[PDB]
Amino acid sequence: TNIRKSHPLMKIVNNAFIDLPAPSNISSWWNFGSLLGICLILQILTGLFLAMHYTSDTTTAFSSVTHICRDVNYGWIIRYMHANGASMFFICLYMHVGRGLYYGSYTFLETWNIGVILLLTVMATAFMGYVLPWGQMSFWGATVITNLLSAIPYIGTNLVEWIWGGFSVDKATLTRFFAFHFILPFIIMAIAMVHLLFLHETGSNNPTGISSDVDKIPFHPYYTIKDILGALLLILALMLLVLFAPDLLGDPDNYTPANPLNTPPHIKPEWYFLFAYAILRSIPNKLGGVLALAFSILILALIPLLHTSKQRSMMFRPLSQCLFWALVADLLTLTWIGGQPVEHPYITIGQLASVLYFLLILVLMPTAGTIENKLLKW
Amino acid sequence: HPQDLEFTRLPNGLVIASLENYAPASRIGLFIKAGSRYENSNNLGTSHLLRLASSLTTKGASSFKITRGIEAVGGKLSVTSTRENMAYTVECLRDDVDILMEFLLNVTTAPEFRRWEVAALQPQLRIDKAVALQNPQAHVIENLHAAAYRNALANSLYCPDYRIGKVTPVELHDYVQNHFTSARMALIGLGVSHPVLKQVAEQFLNIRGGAKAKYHGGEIREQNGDSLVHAALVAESAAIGSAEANAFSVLQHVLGAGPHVKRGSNATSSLYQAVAKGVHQPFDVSAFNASYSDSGLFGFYTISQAASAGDVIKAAYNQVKTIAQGNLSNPDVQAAKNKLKAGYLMSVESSEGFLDEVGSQALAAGSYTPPSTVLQQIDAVADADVINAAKKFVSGRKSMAASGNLGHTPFIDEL
Amino acid sequence: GRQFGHLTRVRHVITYSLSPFEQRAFPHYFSKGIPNVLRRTRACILRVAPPFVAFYLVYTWGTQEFEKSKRKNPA
Amino acid sequence: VDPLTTVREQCEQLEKCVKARERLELCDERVSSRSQTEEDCTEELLDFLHARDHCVAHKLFNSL
Amino acid sequence: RWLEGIRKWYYNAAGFNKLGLMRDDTIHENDDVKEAIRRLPENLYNDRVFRIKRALDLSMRQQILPKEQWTKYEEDKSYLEPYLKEVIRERKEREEWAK
Amino acid sequence: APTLTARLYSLLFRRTSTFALTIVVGALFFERAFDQGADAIYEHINEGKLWKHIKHKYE
Amino acid sequence: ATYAQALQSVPETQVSQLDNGLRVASEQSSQPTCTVGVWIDAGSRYESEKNNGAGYFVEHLAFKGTKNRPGNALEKEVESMGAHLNAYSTREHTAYYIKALSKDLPKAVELLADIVQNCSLEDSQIEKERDVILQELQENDTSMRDVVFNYLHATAFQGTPLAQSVEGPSENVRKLSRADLTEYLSRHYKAPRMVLAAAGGLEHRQLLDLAQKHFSGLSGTETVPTLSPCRFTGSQICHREDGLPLAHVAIAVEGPGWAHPDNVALQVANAIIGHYDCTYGGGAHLSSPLASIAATNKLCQSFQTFNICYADTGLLGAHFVCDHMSIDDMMFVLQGQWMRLCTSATESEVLRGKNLLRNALVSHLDGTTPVCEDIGRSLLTYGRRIPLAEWESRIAEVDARVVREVCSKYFYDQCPAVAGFGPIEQLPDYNRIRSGMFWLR
Amino acid sequence: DLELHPPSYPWSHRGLLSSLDHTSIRRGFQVYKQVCSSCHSMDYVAYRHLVGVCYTEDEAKALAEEVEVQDGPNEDGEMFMRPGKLSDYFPKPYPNPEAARAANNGALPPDLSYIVRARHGGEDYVFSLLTGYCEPPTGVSLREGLYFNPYFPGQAIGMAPPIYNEVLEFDDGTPATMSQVAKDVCTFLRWAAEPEHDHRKRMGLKMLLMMGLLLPLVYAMKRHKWSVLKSRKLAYRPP
Amino acid sequence: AVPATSESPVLDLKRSVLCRESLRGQAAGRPLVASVSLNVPASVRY
Amino acid sequence: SHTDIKVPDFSDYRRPEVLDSTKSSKESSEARKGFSYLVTATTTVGVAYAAKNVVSQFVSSMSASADVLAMSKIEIKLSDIPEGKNMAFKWRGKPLFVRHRTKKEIDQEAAVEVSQLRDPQHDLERVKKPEWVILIGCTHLGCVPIANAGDFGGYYCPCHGSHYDASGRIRKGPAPLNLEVPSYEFTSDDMVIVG
Numbered sequence A: 001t002n003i004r005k006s007h008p009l010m011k012i013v014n015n016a017f018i019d020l021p022a023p024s025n026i027s028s029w030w031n032f033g034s035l036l037g038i039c040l041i042l043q044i045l046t047g048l049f050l051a052m053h054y055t056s057d058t059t060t061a062f063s064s065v066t067h068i069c070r071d072v073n074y075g076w077i078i079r080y081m082h083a084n085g086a087s088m089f090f091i092c093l094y095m096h097v098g099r100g101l102y103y104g105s106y107t108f109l110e111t112w113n114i115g116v117i118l119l120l121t122v123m124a125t126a127f128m129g130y131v132l133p134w135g136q137m138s139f140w141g142a143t144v145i146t147n148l149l150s151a152i153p154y155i156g157t158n159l160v161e162w163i164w165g166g167f168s169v170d171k172a173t174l175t176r177f178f179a180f181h182f183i184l185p186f187i188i189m190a191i192a193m194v195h196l197l198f199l200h201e202t203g204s205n206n207p208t209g210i211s212s213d214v215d216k217i218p219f220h221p222y223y224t225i226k227d228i229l230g231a232l233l234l235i236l237a238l239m240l241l242v243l244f245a246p247d248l249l250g251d252p253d254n255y256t257p258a259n260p261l262n263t264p265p266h267i268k269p270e271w272y273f274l275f276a277y278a279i280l281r282s283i284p285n286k287l288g289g290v291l292a293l294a295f296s297i298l299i300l301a302l303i304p305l306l307h308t309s310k311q312r313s314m315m316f317r318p319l320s321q322c323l324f325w326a327l328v329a330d331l332l333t334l335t336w337i338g339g340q341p342v343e344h345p346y347i348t349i350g351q352l353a354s355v356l357y358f359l360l361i362l363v364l365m366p367t368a369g370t371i372e373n374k375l376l377k378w
Numbered sequence B: 001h002p003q004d005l006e007f008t009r010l011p012n013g014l015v016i017a018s019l020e021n022y023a024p025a026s027r028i029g030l031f032i033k034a035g036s037r038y039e040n041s042n043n044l045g046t047s048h049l050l051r052l053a054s055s056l057t058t059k060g061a062s063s064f065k066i067t068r069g070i071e072a073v074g075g076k077l078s079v080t081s082t083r084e085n086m087a088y089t090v091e092c093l094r095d096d097v098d099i100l101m102e103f104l105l106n107v108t109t110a111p112e113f114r115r116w117e118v119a120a121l122q123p124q125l126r127i128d129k130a131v132a133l134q135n136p137q138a139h140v141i142e143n144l145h146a147a148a149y150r151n152a153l154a155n156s157l158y159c160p161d162y163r164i165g166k167v168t169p170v171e172l173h174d175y176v177q178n179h180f181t182s183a184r185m186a187l188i189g190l191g192v193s194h195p196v197l198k199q200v201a202e203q204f205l206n207i208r209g210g211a212k213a214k215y216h217g218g219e220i221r222e223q224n225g226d227s228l229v230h231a232a233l234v235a236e237s238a239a240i241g242s243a244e245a246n247a248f249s250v251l252q253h254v255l256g257a258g259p260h261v262k263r264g265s266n267a268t269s270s271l272y273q274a275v276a277k278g279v280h281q282p283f284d285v286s287a288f289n290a291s292y293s294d295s296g297l298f299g300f301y302t303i304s305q306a307a308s309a310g311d312v313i314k315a316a317y318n319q320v321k322t323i324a325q326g327n328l329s330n331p332d333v334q335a336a337k338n339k340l341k342a343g344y345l346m347s348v349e350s351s352e353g354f355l356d357e358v359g360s361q362a363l364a365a366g367s368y369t370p371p372s373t374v375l376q377q378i379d380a381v382a383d384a385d386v387i388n389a390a391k392k393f394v395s396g397r398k399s400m401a402a403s404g405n406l407g408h409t410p411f412i413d414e415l
Numbered sequence C: 001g002r003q004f005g006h007l008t009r010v011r012h013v014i015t016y017s018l019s020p021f022e023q024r025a026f027p028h029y030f031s032k033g034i035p036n037v038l039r040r041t042r043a044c045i046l047r048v049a050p051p052f053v054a055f056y057l058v059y060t061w062g063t064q065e066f067e068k069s070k071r072k073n074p075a
Numbered sequence D: 001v002d003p004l005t006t007v008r009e010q011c012e013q014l015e016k017c018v019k020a021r022e023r024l025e026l027c028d029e030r031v032s033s034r035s036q037t038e039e040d041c042t043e044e045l046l047d048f049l050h051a052r053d054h055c056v057a058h059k060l061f062n063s064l
Numbered sequence E: 001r002w003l004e005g006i007r008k009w010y011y012n013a014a015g016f017n018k019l020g021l022m023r024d025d026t027i028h029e030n031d032d033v034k035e036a037i038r039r040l041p042e043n044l045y046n047d048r049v050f051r052i053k054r055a056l057d058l059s060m061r062q063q064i065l066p067k068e069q070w071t072k073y074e075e076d077k078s079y080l081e082p083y084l085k086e087v088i089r090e091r092k093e094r095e096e097w098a099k
Numbered sequence F: 001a002p003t004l005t006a007r008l009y010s011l012l013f014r015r016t017s018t019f020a021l022t023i024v025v026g027a028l029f030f031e032r033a034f035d036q037g038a039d040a041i042y043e044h045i046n047e048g049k050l051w052k053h054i055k056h057k058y059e
Numbered sequence G: 001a002t003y004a005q006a007l008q009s010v011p012e013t014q015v016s017q018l019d020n021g022l023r024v025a026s027e028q029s030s031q032p033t034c035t036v037g038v039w040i041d042a043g044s045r046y047e048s049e050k051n052n053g054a055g056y057f058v059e060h061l062a063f064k065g066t067k068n069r070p071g072n073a074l075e076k077e078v079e080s081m082g083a084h085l086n087a088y089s090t091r092e093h094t095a096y097y098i099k100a101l102s103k104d105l106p107k108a109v110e111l112l113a114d115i116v117q118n119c120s121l122e123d124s125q126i127e128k129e130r131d132v133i134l135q136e137l138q139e140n141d142t143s144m145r146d147v148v149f150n151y152l153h154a155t156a157f158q159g160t161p162l163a164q165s166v167e168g169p170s171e172n173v174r175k176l177s178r179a180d181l182t183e184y185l186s187r188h189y190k191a192p193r194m195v196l197a198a199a200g201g202l203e204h205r206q207l208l209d210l211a212q213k214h215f216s217g218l219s220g221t222e223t224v225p226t227l228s229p230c231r232f233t234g235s236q237i238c239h240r241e242d243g244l245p246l247a248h249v250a251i252a253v254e255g256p257g258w259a260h261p262d263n264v265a266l267q268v269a270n271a272i273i274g275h276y277d278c279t280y281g282g283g284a285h286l287s288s289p290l291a292s293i294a295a296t297n298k299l300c301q302s303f304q305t306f307n308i309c310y311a312d313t314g315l316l317g318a319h320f321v322c323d324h325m326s327i328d329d330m331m332f333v334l335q336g337q338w339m340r341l342c343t344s345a346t347e348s349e350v351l352r353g354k355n356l357l358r359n360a361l362v363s364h365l366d367g368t369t370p371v372c373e374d375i376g377r378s379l380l381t382y383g384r385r386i387p388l389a390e391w392e393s394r395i396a397e398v399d400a401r402v403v404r405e406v407c408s409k410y411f412y413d414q415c416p417a418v419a420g421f422g423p424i425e426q427l428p429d430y431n432r433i434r435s436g437m438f439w440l441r
Numbered sequence H: 001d002l003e004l005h006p007p008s009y010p011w012s013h014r015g016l017l018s019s020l021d022h023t024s025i026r027r028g029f030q031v032y033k034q035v036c037s038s039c040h041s042m043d044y045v046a047y048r049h050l051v052g053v054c055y056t057e058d059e060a061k062a063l064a065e066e067v068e069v070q071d072g073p074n075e076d077g078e079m080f081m082r083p084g085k086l087s088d089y090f091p092k093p094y095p096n097p098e099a100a101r102a103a104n105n106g107a108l109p110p111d112l113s114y115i116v117r118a119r120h121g122g123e124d125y126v127f128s129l130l131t132g133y134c135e136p137p138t139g140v141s142l143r144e145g146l147y148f149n150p151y152f153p154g155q156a157i158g159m160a161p162p163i164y165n166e167v168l169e170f171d172d173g174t175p176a177t178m179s180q181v182a183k184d185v186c187t188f189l190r191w192a193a194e195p196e197h198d199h200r201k202r203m204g205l206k207m208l209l210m211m212g213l214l215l216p217l218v219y220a221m222k223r224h225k226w227s228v229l230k231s232r233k234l235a236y237r238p239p
Numbered sequence I: 001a002v003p004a005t006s007e008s009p010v011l012d013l014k015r016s017v018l019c020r021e022s023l024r025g026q027a028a029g030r031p032l033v034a035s036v037s038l039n040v041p042a043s044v045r046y
Numbered sequence J: 001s002h003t004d005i006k007v008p009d010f011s012d013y014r015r016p017e018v019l020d021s022t023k024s025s026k027e028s029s030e031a032r033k034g035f036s037y038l039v040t041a042t043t044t045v046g047v048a049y050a051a052k053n054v055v056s057q058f059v060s061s062m063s064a065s066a067d068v069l070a071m072s073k074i075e076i077k078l079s080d081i082p083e084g085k086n087m088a089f090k091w092r093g094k095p096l097f098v099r100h101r102t103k104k105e106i107d108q109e110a111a112v113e114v115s116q117l118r119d120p121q122h123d124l125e126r127v128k129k130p131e132w133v134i135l136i137g138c139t140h141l142g143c144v145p146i147a148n149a150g151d152f153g154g155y156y157c158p159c160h161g162s163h164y165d166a167s168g169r170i171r172k173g174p175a176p177l178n179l180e181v182p183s184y185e186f187t188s189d190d191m192v193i194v195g
């Protein structure tokens, strides 16, 4: 008997990274967990190295970020890795969630809900991250988004000024945004460990949605080697962006310093918020729009309750498959519409896409499950 | 230098016998009158524990040293128990007999039986018994004896369930100190000089000293739902050393005492043919013959289908009856003698079996009877003696044991 | 969670396999790979594709509709 | 002497340019003729320049 | 009756039959199904065990069975129904008794 | 003579100690080779455009 | 008189060949009993797929009568002279032998000859022995040890004649006609393929002349059967059957085969690791680290190392029987042992192994029967009896350096064949087993 | 409020592995120096940055020495003016934005350090803007000082056409046409906004090659390990 | 030193008998003997 | 029977070298291992090349940035300072004294007592050229010493009471170590770079 199962630290690593019984048949959509971890560690490192050179003072902030890119040795490659790394994070997140939705992994309730929390935490981190450079889109993005909380009756207006620590997004706001932005990834790392903790209670779902205890394989070597290949593909994607098109997923207006007078033409958040930004602008009323933007993410917590199919995965479920891919294409539409100016036909398209989003999740996909059942005599 | 056996009986009772044969390997055996029979109803299963207990710490060598030291020189240390004797045996290459001898003497003459070691060994009684009782012959033969006797030979070789975990260090000390004595010990050897064995026995085996088996006739029935029924029926035979015992041995081989040919149909076996005449389903039958210092058991053992057990036992019993009635020709008794004569010489063919017979004889009798004298004694059995042995069995008080689904297995008083 | 040897009850299933050093890493990689891919693509295409066709259309319609709206009307 | 104004001429005499240049001249002598209507002709110029400067791009850099 | 055309279509569209699965193999294991599985006789259970083992191995290779070997719609025995029905019927009785 | 892969195995890859030393040595020989080789590819692709090519004009 | 000396005066084995090519071999000593028999280069390896299990079928029919002694006449005669008649068939060796009184050696040799050459093979007797084999095949399914080893061969030497079981598939047992059996016999039972061996009280001269008298008729003359090499494959066979209460695992690397000198050093290494079961006196204090670890931690109920030898190949490894939760840990310590011997075997432990092996083969050759068998088979495998004095020379040559180098050849970084039967859920994945065949240091 | 987006000019650095034409950068710097440094600041570029890019250490020292810059205080407690050095950044035209607005009638000239990165279209955009100045179409007139440029959003910009034929004589004697002046200055403003450009692309090539090597190798290792499972056959054997 | 005829486990499912040819040899004909060792698996004889 | 099981044909998946059922795999065992381990070994070399570069860059990050290297050195013109007079400079946010020394100041600081000094340093090893002494401006509690003053006629401090000679060595005062000799080199006989 070995010192992998015996030693208190190695025991945890042996059970959760070597001898873990994993399904034989898990697809590439199961690699995104690993990749999210890599993203998180990658952000922390690149982030920490950037934090060695950055200053949260409103006057020097933009200058420090540029000083990183010009004077700090390989500061540019660190900087653009961290910025595209944030994009890679969200790509990885949405793929990881999509997997959960399509294959019904959300039945793992605790794992799933901790997921929702993780998503929300990564969002909060990335929102405050984008502010740090103190460019136009940084400042004006932060101003409009934060100020949405003023639409809460009675307290909302106080709340907004309390987050800010003043009367607009200024000195005190940037400094606290830096502090929160530093600490949260570490909180993420902890919550992510709780996430896995719950995941190993059940072990992993698979593409069939049928229990895989009859055909479990050890994690090492099978999935250690796949994860290495996956990681390598993630590095390629990241570095393709960093070394060939670093500004492709950003916005030009974040290269001019923040100006409290000069408003940019079409103020918007970074691409991975655009879907929910579009939902916000569908509703004409402001408090309604905030509650819609809120419910566009929180609805994830509702999904496990909204399950109707007697089958777990969508693999054997044609109607759901189509409605799922409709929901994906709809989200791609909301991201497009989110990027557009508020005009015809983008208002009506946006309204129609937002109605369709909630309709798909709350009405159509539940009904489709029940139709599928009745087609199988169930 | 062509060599035959040497023999010595010391004034203190102890026997030394040794053939120096100049083989590369040397077998040494210390035979002791310390079999299961010398247990009483208070210390049942002590000799079983004692059999498992060599390689526990001794005075001159640790538990660790006994295992390591013997394994170092590629040797073997074995302990063998019958109802009447215990036999402690060592093997090795002839260069290492000194070392192995020291271990043998330590194990037999000064075991410490430490409380923690003895207690730790207790679960081994359960393992050893459990393994052994997978042979259904073990069930029946241990029951058969328990049925057949009131006291000494009735004892089983394996410790009774209730005594497992409960055989004390005191009991082990008592048993050795009371039974492993010069007047009860025979030290046998191959590939070692007789003078050096004598000197070892004088200097290391001079130990000071420390009820007859009443036949009963009973039956014991293990109901267990196997599709096969093992069954043995015996009557009291004669004691080993008496001339009548040789008659039973011949009768055993007239009736049939195990197979000669692989996958063979046993054309000469009186019992097998007697049973196979009536019933053709899977079965086995053999004559059973035990012979001891006090007593003996003779009969037959059947293995039959559950439903056929009645028919098989009755058919086998009938075959002995016709031998007892007088239906027995010379060619049969001649064949039987040739079997037993060949069987005996073949059993002492190996230096393992030879050592067993030299030690075995040395305890139950005065000295060594050569193979030539034994075969002459087999010839000395007249056909009349065989018929008397059979007659004795048929009219003699019966003992029986069975294991299986006994729904069609008769009782003694159903024959 | 649960360790190998406590997962589930399985009876009368034989599994034969080869050492990785006894076999090829890419047996019939194009030969059997290409047809299996086409089969897999055909199997999911008109579940997966139709929504993205619809996106392409709602996109290209909406984009040049925004361009035409910003043009002057001849009246 | 500028290679740019050479190429601008060269490209101006293409089907898509000359058709768009006529569209430009239509509204030139439609607005500048008519009185009191606030419509202008930026749109038509941009139509022309889009077609022109696409061609200019394709081969201007060769002479530089 | 009239929707039997759609049922036959859906069956093949769903396509678990291409992995040699019966409908009752694909049921999401809740506490009732667990109990129902547990109540299956040696034969029905080991069949289930193999069918799934086979299906997962096929899924792992991203392949299906030969069309000859596909579960025919009409040959799909509803093997779990009687056990599952009763497990549910039992629980509903306990739930009722608890009121 | 045994095959080339086999000579590589017996001489370099069999003992894990030699296998590791091989990786370290090979990494060095690879590093200098790859760097110099890939830089050549880059500098030929950008002939006369780099400061390295136009340096001589001002020295 | 020392051990080295004792070996020098062990009775030599006498060696002679007949006109047809049948060898007569014999070790002599004034003994009242003897063993004599016929060993044949024949078995499952020499069988094709359609005649597999014929040699086994023959074995059943061998003692069921002859032309000279029909039915139970052969049987009766053996019994009535107090003779014991026996047979065995391996993948490469069939053998018939008789234990008899020394004075009955003439008749003994006569009867063996009658069995081999003039074997009845009656129509009724065939159809009777057909059901017998089918029932033995069913009995054999309940012996997990037998099943796992048959599996090891089946996977190790897959797609060759060595993958084939001695008994043959039930398919062949049910179909094999008397034509098949007689054709098998005349092809394989030939004088140069056979050896007549005897031990005990026998004048070598007399045996050779008795061989003339009864075995002269043996044929010794297209496509002479010559076994091809057999391809070893690194493979796994996993018969998962949770209904059985203990798991049987058998694992082996490719062994060198009968001929090779390395076999001696391999025996030394195998003796170091040794064997164990739950009834052993040793327990915690045992010398073998695998055994002491296995005893203290209740890993297995039993294990043995085995170096099975065939012609140009073999199976070198171990078999174990253990609790359903112990398979991974058993594999770990066992493979750990192979690695430790490859890399870092010590002088004193090799000396222990040597001493075990010395003792092993000196005491195994005890009594006429095992000595007769050693004569019979050594002539088939080696082409001579190797004297004990020569075995000792080969053993004394083995030191720590040898054990390392020899073990490293066969075990280290090599693909094993794995067979598992029973509740084998835990049994390590082949890759994990294959990775366990090397150390990273 | 219609929009005319710029066309894609085939720059010497347009491609994946294509570096900047440094000679172009050297000319382009002088286009900033002679023309746009009296209106636009370029705060993030110092005289040292030019070294090993477009000028030698010695040339860049001369360029630095040419300019006035404030330094202090001295021991007396006063702010003096001194000749520039490599460590000095490019000097701002005005002391502050408020001064800048006054000199250009309300409109503030943007800093040029990031102008390529800070505008959609980049060097394509700037080139189109500089060469795109033309007479207004019918029905159009702006505030006196706002010129017509079609590429500018809202069709009207507050910058006087800054480049024309022979606005500057180049050090290497390249014929200074309006087009050539614009091409060079854009190439410089590209480097200004993204100094890393060449190193970045050098790394891109080395990454693509290593990925070309490692991906199939890692993939082969994957298939190797997984081959045990890919081959395997299952048999169901009930009694 | 030499391993026994039969390797011994507890809790190991029993080896079956189906015919006359396998069942002969089994009927006990002499009284029990039991051996235990250091090296050899424990055996019980008729 | 279990004898009815025969292993499936693996020919489709086998390596060429192990296809022949009548030949020994042991020929190709040396080779088949070699091929697979080469792939592994190559991969490790590639990953090593990567990790080297990635780690190396990150380590580089923490080292002095381009603008800090820009203030590392200061150029001083030697013909711009007359013989006898001191000239102060701003170097690494500190004053930096360069002093043209006369043939009198050279010989006067040459034959000074070696032992009597608190910090024993001879003049030949405090400077690289005889007529130029370069020093960083007080070692005790940090002030800026005033040139052409003091008892020993070099540098004097109005803070506590230190007296430095013309070679920059402490003679009479509370300072523990002499004014510090920085790292420098003369490039052209007209110019000096300090740093």
Ligand SMILES: CC1=Nc2ccccc2C(=O)C1c1ccc(Cc2ccc(OC(F)(F)F)cc2)cc1
Binding pocket: A016, A017, A022, A026, A030, A031, A033, A034, A035, A037, A038, A040, A041, A189, A192, A193, A196, A204, A223, A227
């Ligand atoms: C734990 C896992 N369970 C699984 C279960 C089923 C299917 C796949 C997997 C995995 O791929 C998987 C895993 C994930 C990640 C890694 C590398 C790694 C990267 C970052 C980490 O930091 C932290 F924040 F803790 F997440 C930790 C580990 C290796 C393996």
Ligand code: FES
Binding pocket: J138, J140, J141, J142, J143, J157, J158, J159, J160, J161, J162, J173, J174, J175
């Ligand atoms: S502070 Fe100037 S010497 Fe003390």
